[PDB]
Design a protein around this nucleic acid. Structure first.
Lengths: 45, 57
DNA sequence: TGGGGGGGCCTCT
DNA sequence: AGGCCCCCCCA
């Protein structure tokens, strides 16, 4: 129901920067963006 | 007692991020394939995989 | 011991 | 969205 992820300080900083550079309001939409832009690497796992 | 925030270019921000129900499905799917204990290692991986997309702003 | 993770819930903007 | 509490596991 309320699904959340706990980030490390190091990772949080890198991630929020990606979110800011993407200009997205919600973090969840940045996580959608990273997943879509990495399917080729994901699919190869 | 517990480190919960991080300072960013746009202020303080929490280290515990909420995910939409759909997005959780996808991300947890990714965490399963990577086998990482903690989620930050997965997020690191995504970021590194998306490097060129990030670099083109 | 200290520190990590998630679940479950509340209360505000 | 921030915040609290809890509980489990690891280091």
């Amino acid at each position: 129901r309320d699904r959340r992820v706990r980030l490390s300080a190091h990772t949080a900083i890198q991630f929020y920067d990606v979110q800011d550079r993407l200009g997205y309001d919600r973090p969840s939409k940045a996580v959608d963006w990273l997943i879509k832009k990495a399917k080729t690497a994901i699919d190869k796992l | 007692d517990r480190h919960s925030k991080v300072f960013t270019s746009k202020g303080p921000r929490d280290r515990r991020v909420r995910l939409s129900a759909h997005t959780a499905i996808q991300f947890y799917d990714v965490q399963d394939r990577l086998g990482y204990d903690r989620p930050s290692k997965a997020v690191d991986w995504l970021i590194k995989k998306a490097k060129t997309a990030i670099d083109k702003l």
